Amino acid sequence: FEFTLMVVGESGLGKSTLINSLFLTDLIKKTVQVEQSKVLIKEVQLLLTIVDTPGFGDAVDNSNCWQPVIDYIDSKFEDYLNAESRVNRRQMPDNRVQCCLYFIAPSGHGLKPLDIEFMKRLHEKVNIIPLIAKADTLTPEECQQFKKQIMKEIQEHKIKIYLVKKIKDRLPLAVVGSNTIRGRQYPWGVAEVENGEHCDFTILRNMLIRTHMQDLKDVTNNVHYENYRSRKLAA
């Protein structure tokens, strides 16, 4: 079972920490770059190509910093299109990005111009799961208000983001990534990762491992790839 997961976000949002917490243990100029690392998990076979975006914030300039992401995604769509167009399609590789994790910087306030510009330009090319990075920065009052402010700005700009009722209620997911003994040690308290009262991490962790990836795999193949196919052949 192969799966391609992309992570896009400003540097220092706990992106790499989240990956290490989702899957146990550890793992510039001129911008922007597109890199990938593969992870094999055995128990059951799991091929996991993780697409990093060594941009991205990050900061000045940032003009068309979404483009290298767009180029990579459409490149893999082009590869799949040319693969099934050949007379001898036998051993076909599938390197299309099934899922994309976008890390929104708190706070907050609303979505920053960069968050709007990326999501509005990538929502029809990849499955986007918006995440409030470093969720332990926000109080329960702020976290709730930040979610509603994001969701209203998503609807306003016509952005199409990707037990089911519990998922829609807590969108976008506020997440905290951590290691050791599991959470983060502050001199006043400890923020637990596997807690529902603390994080939406368990909601995200469940949304991947127990083969919800297959749903993401189907949407990418049936919607995102097919829209690319219809566009590049008509004109």
Which residues of this protein are in contact with ligand GDP, per CB under 6 A?
9, 11-17, 107-108, 134, 136-137, 142, 176-177
- State in angstroms the smallest separation of the CB of 37 from ligand GDP: 13
189 part of the interface to a copy of itself, by CB under 8 A: yes
- Annotated binding-site residue? 147: no
Nearer to ligand GDP, 77 or 183 (CB): 183
Q: How many residues bind a copy of itself (CB under 8 A)?
A: 36
- Annotated binding-site residue? 110: no
- State in angstroms the smallest separation of the CB of 176 from ligand GDP: 4
DSSP states of the chain as a string?
A: -EEEEEEEE-TTSSHHHHHHHHSSS---PSP---EEEEEEE----EEEEEEE----S--S--TTTTHHHHHHHHHHHHHHHHHHHSS---S-------EEEEEEPS--SS--HHHHHHHHHHTTTS-EEEEESSGGGS-HHHHHHHHHHHHHHHHHTT-----HHHHHHTPSEE--------EEE-SS-EEESS-TTT-SHHHHHHTTTTTTHHHHHHHIIIIIHHHHHHHHHH-
Nearer to a copy of itself, 26 or 141 (CB): 141
54 part of the interface to a copy of itself, by CB under 8 A: no
Nearer to a copy of itself, 194 or 226 (CB): 194
- Annotated binding-site residue? 4: no
Nearer to ligand GDP, 108 or 130 (CB): 108
- Annotated binding-site residue? 53: no
- Annotated binding-site residue? 178: no
CA-based nearest residue to 99, from 73, 121, 79, 120: 73
Which among ligand GDP, a copy of itself, none contacts residue 196 (Cβ within 5 to 8 A by kind)? none
Nearer to a copy of itself, 109 or 182 (CB): 109
Closest CB to ligand GDP belongs to which residue? 14
Task: Name the region of 216 (left: φ>0; alpha: ψ -120 to 50; beta: rest).
Answer: alpha
198 part of the interface to a copy of itself, by CB under 8 A: yes
For a copy of itself, the binding residue among 59, 92, 209, 223 (CB under 8 A) is 59
